[PDB]
Swiss-Prot record, chain A:
Binds to host ACE2. RBD also interacts with the N-linked glycan on 'Asn-90' of ACE2. Cleavage of S generates a polybasic C-terminal sequence on S1 that binds to host Neuropilin-1 (NRP1) and Neuropilin-2 (NRP2) receptors. Interacts with host integrin alpha-5/beta-1 (ITGA5:ITGB1) and with ACE2 in complex with integrin alpha-5/beta-1 (ITGA5:ITGB1). May interact via cytoplasmic c-terminus with M protein. May interact (via N-terminus) with host bilirubin and biliverdin, thereby preventing antibody binding to the SARS-CoV-2 spike NTD via an allosteric mechanism. Attaches the virion to the cell membrane by interacting with host receptor, initiating the infection. The major receptor is host ACE2. When S2/S2' has been cleaved, binding to the receptor triggers direct fusion at the cell membrane. When S2/S2' has not been cleaved, binding to the receptor results in internalization of the virus by endocytosis using host TFRC and GRM2 and leading to fusion of the virion membrane with the host endosomal membrane. Alternatively, may use NRP1/NRP2 and integrin as entry receptors. The gene is S. Residues 13-15 are annotated as: Integrin-binding motif. It comes from the Viruses. This is Spike protein S1.
Amino acid sequence: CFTNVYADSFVIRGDEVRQIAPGQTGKIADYNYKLPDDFTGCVIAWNS
Amino acid sequence: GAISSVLNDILARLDKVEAEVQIDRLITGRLQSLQTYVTQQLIRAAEI
C-alpha cells in the first residue's frame, strides 16, 4: 500500500529513455524531468 | 579497494550515485581505522 501514487508522464527519443533511472545525470534527467539518487518509484515505457 | 584517498579527484570525475560505490569505501576503511585506535586505546588504558 502507498501513502500516494504520483505518476509523471512525457514522450522522449529512445536514446534518452535510459535517463529515466535513479540519480541519472545528463541533459533530460538534469533539466527536463528528474529522479533523485533514492527514487522510490518505477519507470514504465514502450516504443510509441 | 577504491581509487583515491584524497577526496576531490573522485568528485571531479564521477556522478552523485557511483559516488555511493567510491566514497563509502574510504569512509568504511577510515571508520575501521578509528575503531582500531579506539579499541586499542581502550585496551591500552587498562594497562595504565
